[PDB]
Amino acid sequence: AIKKAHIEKDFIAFCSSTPDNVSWRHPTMGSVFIGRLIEHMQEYACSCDVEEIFRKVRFSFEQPDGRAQMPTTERVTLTRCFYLFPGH
Amino acid sequence: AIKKAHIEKDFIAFCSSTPDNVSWRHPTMGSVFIGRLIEHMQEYACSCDVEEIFRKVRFSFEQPDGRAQMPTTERVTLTRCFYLFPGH
Amino acid sequence: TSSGSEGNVKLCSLEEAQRIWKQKSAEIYPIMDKSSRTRLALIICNEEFDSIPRRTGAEVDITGMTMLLQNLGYSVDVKKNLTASDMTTELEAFAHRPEHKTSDSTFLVFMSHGIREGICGKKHSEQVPDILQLNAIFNMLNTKNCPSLKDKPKVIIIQACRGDSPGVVWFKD
Amino acid sequence: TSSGSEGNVKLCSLEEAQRIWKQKSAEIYPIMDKSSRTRLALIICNEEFDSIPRRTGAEVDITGMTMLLQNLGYSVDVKKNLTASDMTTELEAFAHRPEHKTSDSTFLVFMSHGIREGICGKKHSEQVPDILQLNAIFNMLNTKNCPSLKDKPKVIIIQACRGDSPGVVWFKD
Ligand SMILES: *CC(=O)[C@H](CC(=O)O)NC(=O)[C@H](CCCCNC(=O)c1ccc(Nc2cnc3ccccc3n2)cc1)c1cccs1
Numbered sequence: 001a002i003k004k005a006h007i008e009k010d011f012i013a014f015c016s017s018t019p020d021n022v023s024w025r026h027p028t029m030g031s032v033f034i035g036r037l038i039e040h041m042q043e044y045a046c047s048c049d050v051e052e053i054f055r056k057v058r059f060s061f062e063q064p065d066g067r068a069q070m071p072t073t074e075r076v077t078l079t080r081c082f083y084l085f086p087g088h
Numbered sequence: 089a090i091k092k093a094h095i096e097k098d099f100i101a102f103c104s105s106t107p108d109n110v111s112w113r114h115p116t117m118g119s120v121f122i123g124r125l126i127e128h129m130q131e132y133a134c135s136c137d138v139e140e141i142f143r144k145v146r147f148s149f150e151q152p153d154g155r156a157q158m159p160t161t162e163r164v165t166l167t168r169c170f171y172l173f174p175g176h
Numbered sequence: 177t178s179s180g181s182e183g184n185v186k187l188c189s190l191e192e193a194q195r196i197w198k199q200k201s202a203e204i205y206p207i208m209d210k211s212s213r214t215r216l217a218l219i220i221c222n223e224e225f226d227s228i229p230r231r232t233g234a235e236v237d238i239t240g241m242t243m244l245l246q247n248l249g250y251s252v253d254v255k256k257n258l259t260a261s262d263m264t265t266e267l268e269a270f271a272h273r274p275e276h277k278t279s280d281s282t283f284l285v286f287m288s289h290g291i292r293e294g295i296c297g298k299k300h301s302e303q304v305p306d307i308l309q310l311n312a313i314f315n316m317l318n319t320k321n322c323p324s325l326k327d328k329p330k331v332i333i334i335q336a337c338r339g340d341s342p343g344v345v346w347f348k349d
Numbered sequence: 350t351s352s353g354s355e356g357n358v359k360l361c362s363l364e365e366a367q368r369i370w371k372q373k374s375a376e377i378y379p380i381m382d383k384s385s386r387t388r389l390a391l392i393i394c395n396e397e398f399d400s401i402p403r404r405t406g407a408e409v410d411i412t413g414m415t416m417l418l419q420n421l422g423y424s425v426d427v428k429k430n431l432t433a434s435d436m437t438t439e440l441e442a443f444a445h446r447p448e449h450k451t452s453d454s455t456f457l458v459f460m461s462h463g464i465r466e467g468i469c470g471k472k473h474s475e476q477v478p479d480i481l482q483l484n485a486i487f488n489m490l491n492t493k494n495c496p497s498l499k500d501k502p503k504v505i506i507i508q509a510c511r512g513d514s515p516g517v518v519w520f521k522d
């Protein structure tokens with residue numbers, strides 16, 4: 001038999017800035033959002049779900065410098081916590 | 089002196105369905121998303137941050153019936169956990 | 177008991193409040209003292225429309241949400257049957273409220289008919305669209321247009337369709 | 350050690366993995382067995398453009414993200430300097446990959462110039478826009494267009510501007 005499923009579910013998007021706003025990149029160091037995301041994933045994938053990690057990345061941008069940007073979590077339909085369980 | 093602040097920060101939006109899609113309402117029982125949100129807030133405000141509560145509401149819609157809808161968390165710039173601390 | 181100000185909302189005990197304050201570090205939004213804080217919330221609900229069907233049952237949602245936000249410690253403004261222009265004017269007025277200065281957070285609740293582009297005002301029709309975009313709600317409440325809520329959680333809840341589609345696809349088990 | 354497959358990514362111990370599986374109930378996404386699962390990830394990065402400045406430093410991002418997703422157990426496809434049409438075609442091809450059936454999740458990474466409307470393809474200019482919308486990425490990966498990833502977390506990461514504004518406002522302390 002056939003069954004109904006939600007057309008859109010279990011998504012999470014993470015953008016480098018808020019709408020209307022710029023995102024920064026260094027010619028040799030790369031994109032700050034990308035570098036920050038990797039560092040947080042390396043540190044927190046073992047203990048935090050991806051949504052919590054994304055919030056932590058956001059928090060690291062909280063104090064604005066000369067290159068302020070605020071990464072934004074978008075269109076979330078995760079019904080559960082997504083743990084990476086690195087090593088497993 | 090003057091200081092820079094992020095133009096957009098500490099927001100969370102919670103919509104009743106995914107983009108393109110309908111949201112349901114009963115003539116005497118009200119809107120299912122609204123009713124479900126209240127019930128979860130009443131139950132989980134004491135222990136969970138609002139983002140966790142919104143995920144729980146989403147989870148309650150996971151199994152699709154004849155009136156399937158998937159509430160969506162949108163444009164999140166919460167840098168911290170938002171606990172309501174009801175009673176305080 | 178449900179006789180108190182928090183009604184049916186389960187209470188957070190002093191032990192639970194300290195447990196949360198310990199499990200997470202400086203990663204929780206600060207809460208203002210209960211005796212002095214002036215929390216505000218706004219509900220806009222459209223039920224009666226010029227050209228689209230009546231939203232029967234909206235009263236249950238208004239009651240439910242109003243009581244809930246009051247239980248959580250917010251003073252609730254309820255506005256009904258507004259055009260998108262009226263909604264904008266009410267949102268701007270809300271952003272200008274002095275109580276936000278002595279508040280730690282806010283809730284915004286929108287309940288209406290909706291399309292892909294946004295939320296329907298009372299005068300909405302296909303011929304003459306009366307729509308408030310979600311983008312506009314954010315803009316009106318951001319740091320530029322609402323400096324009093326800087327660093328403070330702003331929770332937006334929208335009950336509305338976002339299109340005509342049923343939101344489902346078939347699969348065989 | 351960083352000599353292993355997980356590199357610089359801190360490992361989750363058996364005790365920690367059971368603690369997480371205990372602290373939260375049936376509210377975690379199921380992980381497939383490591384020996385049989387075929388995790389896939391896609392990185393699209395535009396660095397060389399026809400009309401807009403070169404994205405110097407993109408190689409650092411490509412390297413960083415590729416190694417990270419591999420560390421997390423994903424097979425990483427890297428595609429470079431594509432038009433929006435090419436991105437669409439690559440996304441559709443990715444959605445059709447048989448490995449998703451024996452995968453538990455996916456990561457999609459987009460890195461390019463961007464405007465308010467979306468992500469810039471290699472041929473983008475103001476005269477002739479070459480834009481991929483975020484909405485389109487979701488549509489291409491949803492249950493209708495990618496049934497193999499039904500019930501499975503799909504993580505989309507976008508490094509791009511979303512407009513010209515600095516994202517700041519002034520306040521006096
Ligand atoms: C599309 C819209 O913009 C609008 C959104 C809104 O008004 O909030 N939706 C509609 O106008 C419209 C919804 C009316 C559909 C009729 N209702 C039902 O068929 C129906 C049947 C059964 C139930 N049952 C139920 C069970 N538990 C509940 C718990 C709490 C609250 C309510 C509960 N209801 C509900 C509704 C639509 C237009 C197209 C599709 S939906």
Ligand SMILES: *CC(=O)[C@H](CC(=O)O)NC(=O)[C@H](CCCCNC(=O)c1ccc(Nc2cnc3ccccc3n2)cc1)c1cccs1
Pocket residue numbers: 022023024025026027029030031032033035036067404461462463464508509510511
């Ligand atoms: C607007 C865009 O679409 C585009 C997005 C993209 O290419 O990813 N951005 C730009 O084209 C452009 C960014 C280039 C700005 C020049 N860079 C800097 O001024 C600059 C200066 C100093 C640093 N420092 C720094 C410190 N720590 C880092 C850690 C990790 C990675 C990088 C780090 N960089 C960085 C950059 C823009 C156009 C308008 C505004 S931004």
